[PDB]
């Protein structure tokens, strides 16, 4: 927000931010440049750094759907020595909010899991346990 007055180091970050702003909003066409920014704390960011001559076209990364999870796991399995029997779509269904690289990590863990015994096939349930009383 650039107005918080906590302590030092803050103000240094604000000069660096303002230098960024200058570098593309000043008396300079800056024609031969292409800035692409990447952030995760979407909400908390400088209102001026924000956009409209600075960071426009703010593409958004959503949570992958079932299809997206199926596609990502397929992509990571392309080089995997998968046997000719896969429920990729149903594994995507099992994902249940498995958005991030977790798909890649799971394909790797499945490789290691099969490698326990030296195999090339998908159990499809040891795959969930790689994924990761009372009633039931």
């Amino acid at each position: 927000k650039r107005f918080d007055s906590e302590k030092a180091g803050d103000r240094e970050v604000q000069r660096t931010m303002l230098e960024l702003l200058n570098q593309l909003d000043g008396f300079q066409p800056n024609t031969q440049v292409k800035v692409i920014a990447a952030t995760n704390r979407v909400d908390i960011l400088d209102p001026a750094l924000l956009r409209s001559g600075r960071l426009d076209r703010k593409i958004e990364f959503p949570m992958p759907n079932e299809e997206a999870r199926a596609r990502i796991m397929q992509i990571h399995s392309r080089k995997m020595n998968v046997s000719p029997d896969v429920n990729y779509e149903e594994l995507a269904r099992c994902t249940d909010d498995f958005n991030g690289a977790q798909c890649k990590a799971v394909c790797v863990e499945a490789g290691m899991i099969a490698l326990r015994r030296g195999a090339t096939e998908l159990t499809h349930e040891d795959y969930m346990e790689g994924i990761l009383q009372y009633y039931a």
């Binding site: 429920n87 149903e90 269904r93 099992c94 249940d96 909010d97 349930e125 009633y135 039931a136």
Partner: protein, 237 residues
């Protein structure tokens, strides 16, 4: 996800509500139950778990009305409360009208209730997922209900842990579904449970409960022995 994840009354800055997601997680943690149906028969094949070798398997098939049965997966306490509620509703409906309560109406009412304590800062959802097999004037009905109240009228559905194998089998064999005898109906449900269960584990006549409803047959429960003919006639691998 710091904060934004206590009580249903708090809206996350993502359009998301997470207590409901947790309730659905508990639904998955519940045990496997598959419901499927033909023109005139609805079969719920359910895996009753064994907490201990000295403790009998937890029954999970409840006959609420003559023409309505439920298979539960999740908190047994909330399942019991909901079963009591549906029994009361069926009795009241029969009292007011000498009719079998329509399955769709019953499921809608249950969804409404389980929604009600999702908009007040004093209560919690019901982490219980139900598969309902009913037989109304329109015939057999298979419904799935979750804590979110998003009831789904399905040709064949599966809930609880390991439900994905049942989902796969049902999707594969839907074409056959709606075109099979009652025995084939039960056999397909049993095959779904076999796929869901670990390969080493096999459906004895102790782990399976079969609730069958349909024309000229009020919802009948088959446990212990009544499951025996189906398992005996069932195919193997």
């Amino acid at each position: 996800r710091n904060q934004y994840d206590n009580d249903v009354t708090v809206w996350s800055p993502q359009g998301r509500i997470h207590q409901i997601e947790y309730a659905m997680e508990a639904v998955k943690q519940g045990s496997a139950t598959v419901g499927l149906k033909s023109k005139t028969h609805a079969v719920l094949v359910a895996l009753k778990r064994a907490q201990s070798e000295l403790a009998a398997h937890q029954k999970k098939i409840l006959h609420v009305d003559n023409h309505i049965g439920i298979s539960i997966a999740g908190l047994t306490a909330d399942a019991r409360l909901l079963c009591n509620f549906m029994r009361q509703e069926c009795l009241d409906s029969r009292f007011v009208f000498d009719r079998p309560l329509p399955v769709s109406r019953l499921v809608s009412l249950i969804g409404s209730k389980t929604q009600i304590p999702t908009q007040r800062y004093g209560r919690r959802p019901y982490g219980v997922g139900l598969l309902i097999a009913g037989y109304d004037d329109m015939g057999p009905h298979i419904f799935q209900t979750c804590p979110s109240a998003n009831y789904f009228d399905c040709r064949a559905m599966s809930i609880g842990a390991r439900s994905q194998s049942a989902r796969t089998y049902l999707e594969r064999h839907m074409s056959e579904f709606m075109e099979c005898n009652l025995n084939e109906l039960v056999k397909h449900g049993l095959r779904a449970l076999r796929e869901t269960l670990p390969a080493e584990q096999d459906l004895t006549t102790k782990n399976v409960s079969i609730g069958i409803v349909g024309k000229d047959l009020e919802f009948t429960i088959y446990d212990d022995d009544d499951v025996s003919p189906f398992l005996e006639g069932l195919e193997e691998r």
